[PDB]
């Protein structure tokens, strides 16, 4: 259940003593390290040519947030505030009121992207699959206030990436 690492006593034989003297004087293991590095020179380097190549990803990937809609135009969120209550970083602020046709919808849905820890609890606490964490990750901005998303930005992200989030949810939803 255990092994004695580094308890190997040397051998006192004169032939092996001369071999160790030759290794000492002529630097055998140093040339061994040189040869290993030389063999490592002649391999294919693992550099992918970004931005013309992208690293592999999975359909469960957690990137930029988005708000989805039903396949008729109606938005999926119903202002149930489960995402803002399960959010570990308190990055979600929701204010709601009934709209002109008496449907329970939001008037304010803000996600602070600089507080969000990108753990994906909101996309799994949503009972209607409204909020999703899409596959977008190249969305760095030049200003702090550009990373404070309101409802219009989230709806624009949903309309921008629906063609991908629908396919990813279709590929993944049998595991959830």
């Amino acid at each position: 259940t255990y092994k004695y690492v580094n308890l190997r006593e040397p051998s006192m034989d004169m032939k092996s003593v001369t071999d160790r003297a030759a290794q000492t004087l002529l630097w055998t293991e140093l040339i061994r390290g040189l040869g290993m590095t030389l063999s490592y020179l002649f391999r294919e380097p693992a550099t992918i040519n970004y931005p013309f190549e992208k690293g592999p990803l999975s359909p469960r990937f957690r990137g930029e947030h988005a708000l989805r809609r039903y396949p008729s135009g109606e938005e999926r969120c119903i202002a149930c505030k489960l995402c803002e209550a399960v959010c570990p970083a308190q990055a979600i602020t929701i204010e709601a009121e009934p709209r002109a046709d008496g449907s329970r919808r939001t008037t304010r849905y803000d996600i602070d992207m600089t507080k969000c820890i990108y753990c994906g609890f909101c996309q799994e606490a949503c009972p209607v699959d409204a909020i999703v964490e899409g596959p977008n990750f190249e969305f760095s901005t030049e200003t702090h206030e550009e990373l404070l998303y309101n409802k219009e930005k989230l709806l624009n992200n949903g309309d921008k990436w629906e063609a991908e989030i629908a396919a990813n949810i279709q590929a993944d939803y049998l595991y959830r």
């Binding site: 380097p45 693992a46 550099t47 992918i48 970004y50 931005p51 992208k54 690293g55 570990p88 970083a89 308190q90 602070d112 992207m113 600089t114 507080k115 969000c116 820890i117 990108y118 753990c119 990750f137 190249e138 969305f139 760095s140 901005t141 030049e142 200003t143 702090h144 550009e146 990373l147």
Partner: protein
């Protein structure tokens, strides 16, 4: 005429020479430092783009704030930023350096590194992926390309 052409060419030359020779300093604090050195791994290899680490602040160009900036760390970060010679650039990594992230309401966490240093590029994520950090570096390069310093000097 000719002077505007000359200063535009000189601006293009110095912008290319500055954006193709970004030397970031070895500075990390937390998870996001591990992701930054994963960006420096052979898969992505930022050394292709002329981006090579230089440990001293005097020989660096861009400072990458990757990690959580606590109250005990803020004077050190500010001092190291001040010792960096002009021109200098700042890239914010992760939610901790952006707005505090998980620890925004913490008693000993500075809510965003923009309260201490002037930040050019904000890279969001927790951690932002190595591709995301490479995207932020390329965005900073494209921002450097759009500088009109000698044009502004000639016009003023």
């Amino acid at each position: 005429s000719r002077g505007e052409y000359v200063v535009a060419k000189l601006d293009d030359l110095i912008n290319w020479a500055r954006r193709s020779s970004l030397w970031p300093m070895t500075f990390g604090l937390a998870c996001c430092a591990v992701e930054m050195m994963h960006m420096a791994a052979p898969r992505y290899d930022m050394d292709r783009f002329g981006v090579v680490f230089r440990a001293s602040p005097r020989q660096s160009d861009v400072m990458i704030v990757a990690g959580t900036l606590t109250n005990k760390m803020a004077p050190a970060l500010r001092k190291v930023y001040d010792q960096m010679p002009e021109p200098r650039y700042v890239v914010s990594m992760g939610s901790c350096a952006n707005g505090g992230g998980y620890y925004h309401y913490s008693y000993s966490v500075v809510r965003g590194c923009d309260r201490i240093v002037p930040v050019d590029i904000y890279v969001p994520g927790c951690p932002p992926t190595a591709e995301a950090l490479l995207y932020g570096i390329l965005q900073l390069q494209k921002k450097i390309k759009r500088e009109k310093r000698l044009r502004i000097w000639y016009r003023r």
